[PDB]
Symmetry: D2
Subunit: 47 residues, 4 copies
Amino acid sequence: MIEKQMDRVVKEMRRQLEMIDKLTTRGIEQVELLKRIHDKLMIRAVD
Amino acid sequence: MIEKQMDRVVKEMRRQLEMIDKLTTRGIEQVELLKRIHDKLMIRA
Amino acid sequence: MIEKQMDRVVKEMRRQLEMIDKLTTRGIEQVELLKRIHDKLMIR
Amino acid sequence: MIEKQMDRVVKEMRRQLEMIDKLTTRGIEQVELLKRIHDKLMIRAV
């Protein structure tokens, strides 16, 4: 049945997109951590 | 200064990741809409 | 010597974005598995 | 109707995913640009 094949695909896509979402959130955390590093450099760049 | 180049890049990356996030959310909505389509098909046969 | 901390973060971001890339490519495959399903339905 | 509706959805998703892909590639470029910045910092450190 194609409807059962469609089901397997839909579940997989949901699962892929949820992972991409988790990774994206983890990336945004890293970007903040990168902003903090930029800041430390700026503080050191003055003295 | 490198530090100002780093700043421009960090800001850009955040902006890219926020877009990817919006698109991902939009995709999950579409996947639900696809689950609804699969259900209609199940009802039809 | 933060730079080592910056390094650890940059490597991790590279790793995260490469995963997102693999998943994105897997999604595009799926999107075509779906177009084939659409086609089978049309043939019906 | 459902078949054509499904088609709309699928085209939309393919478009969303291709954008995510472009952005991901742009992120990878930025990460390289960041590696280069780290290196410059290393050179300036000594």
